[PDB]
Amino acid sequence: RPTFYRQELNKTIWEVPERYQNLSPVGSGAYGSVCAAFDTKTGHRVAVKKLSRPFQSIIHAKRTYRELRLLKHMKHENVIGLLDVFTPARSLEEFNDVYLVTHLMGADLNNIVKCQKLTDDHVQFLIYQILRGLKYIHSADIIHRDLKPSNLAVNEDCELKILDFGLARHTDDEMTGYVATRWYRAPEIMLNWMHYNQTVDIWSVGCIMAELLTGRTLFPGTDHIDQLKLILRLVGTPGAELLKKISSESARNYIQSLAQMPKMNFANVFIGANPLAVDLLEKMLVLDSDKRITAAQALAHAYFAQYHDPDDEPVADPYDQSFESRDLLIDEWKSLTYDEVISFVPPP
Numbered sequence: 637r638p639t640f641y642r643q644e645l646n647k648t649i650w651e652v653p654e655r656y657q658n659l660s661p662v663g664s665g666a667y668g669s670v671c672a673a674f675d676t677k678t679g680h681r682v683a684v685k686k687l688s689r690p691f692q693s694i695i696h697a698k699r700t701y702r703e704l705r706l707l708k709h710m711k712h713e714n715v716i717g718l719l720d721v722f723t724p725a726r727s728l729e730e731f732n733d734v735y736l737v738t739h740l741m742g743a744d745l746n747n748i749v750k751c752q753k754l755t756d757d758h759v760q761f762l763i764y765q766i767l768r769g770l771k772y773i774h775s776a777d778i779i780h781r782d783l784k785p786s787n788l789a790v791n792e793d794c795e796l797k798i799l800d801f802g803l804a805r806h807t808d809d810e811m812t813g814y815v816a817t818r819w820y821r822a823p824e825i826m827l828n829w830m831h832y833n834q835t836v837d838i839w840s841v842g843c844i845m846a847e848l849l850t851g852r853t854l855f856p857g858t859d860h861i862d863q864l865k866l867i868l869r870l871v872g873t874p875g876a877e878l879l880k881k882i883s884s885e886s887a888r889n890y891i892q893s894l895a896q897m898p899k900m901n902f903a904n905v906f907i908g909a910n911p912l913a914v915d916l917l918e919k920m921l922v923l924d925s926d927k928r929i930t931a932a933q934a935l936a937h938a939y940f941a942q943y944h945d946p947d948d949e950p951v952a953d954p955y956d957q958s959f960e961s962r963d964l965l966i967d968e969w970k971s972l973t974y975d976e977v978i979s980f981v982p983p984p
């Protein structure tokens with residue numbers, strides 16, 4: 637067990653191993669507080685996140701367990717990994733607090749799309765890396781569910797990592813009105829049309845790719861209905877085949893109330909783009925999720941010819957998510973989490 641030291645940073649007690657120095661506040665959502673630190677064992681600048689109220693309800697205890705299981709599994713160059721996890725508790729009986737340690741991310745994709753000039757070569761490399769990371773995530777039957785520019789870290793060498801997996805966190809207030817939290821979501825999840833699957837993440841990649849090519853949000857809806865009208869003007873209204881797959885009768889009645897529209901000409905929307913980029917966007921931005929290109933198929937598309945290496949596009953170890961259907965008490969979720977903290981082995 638390392639030695640721990642205590643300090644108060646903005647109304648919060650932090651108790652951390654001596655290896656982590658020069659802690660300074662960086663942010664705080666409702667899920668925890670974050671400090672930047674220097675990790676003297678590795679020489680990395682790191683983010684230290686202290687969870688807030690991790691075991692306050694069954695829903696909260698299960699979310700804590702879910703986040704720690706996911707972060708411990710993800711071992712890929714284009715996905716955030718877990719550098720460390722610790723608790724100052726010396727036993728299960730005094731266990732209350734969880735701290736997670738990752739590499740400190742500087743810029744996101746929002747800090748390069750808005751304020752920089754991207755060539756076709758930059759777009760090929762950035763989207764290649766997102767798809768390499770997604771092949772790995774999808775091979776574990778994990779859905780990200782929240783891909784958008786603010787969840788993609790990028791360095792000065794244009795190297796990219798996926799972060800901030802959807803832990804089923806987002807509220808109705810957060811998805812209301814003229815908000816980036818909804819502009820990248822697939823229409824079947826935005827409007828609860830049907831049981832969704834991993835194809836939702838490829839819709840989000842299409843929206844991101846379009847925005848790197850034009851410098852403008854593809855579907856900046858003022859609300860759910862405005863955003864659906866923007867989507868159907870580009871891709872066309874649904875045919876009888878997709879309408880049969882929509883489980884809500886009211887959702888089907890509403891769609892049928894709209895005048896029919898054909899798919900637009902993507903070369904006339906993405907004026908001057910690489911024709912191979914236009915072709916790949918037409919294969920991602922398909923309304924019927926069964927017919928979208930997969931991550932593994934997209935890596936083999938001719939747009940990525942200068943980066944594609946089928947011997948360096950790895951898949952994940954198997955991921956057991958059977959806990960998701962399990963009914964447990966707060967203290968049972970808390971014991972499972974404690975075991976995952978004490979069994980952690982750091983990366984090489």
Ligand SMILES: C/C(=N\Cc1cccnc1)c1ccc(Cl)cc1
Nearest residue numbers: 755757758759761793794795943
């Ligand atoms: C960093 C980088 N390339 C590294 C690299 C070497 C060999 C194979 N694959 C990737 C890079 C930078 C800017 C643009 Cl626009 C594109 C790529």
Ligand SMILES: [Cl-]
Nearest residue numbers: 638653654655
């Ligand atoms: Cl230490």
Ligand SMILES: [Cl-]
Nearest residue numbers: 715716717739
């Ligand atoms: Cl990482």
Ligand SMILES: [Cl-]
Nearest residue numbers: 725731732733
């Ligand atoms: Cl504790």
Ligand SMILES: [Cl-]
Nearest residue numbers: 784785786816
């Ligand atoms: Cl964003």
Ligand SMILES: [Cl-]
Nearest residue numbers: 954955956957
């Ligand atoms: Cl597993």
Ligand SMILES: [Mg+2]
Nearest residue numbers: 786787799800
């Ligand atoms: Mg985020």
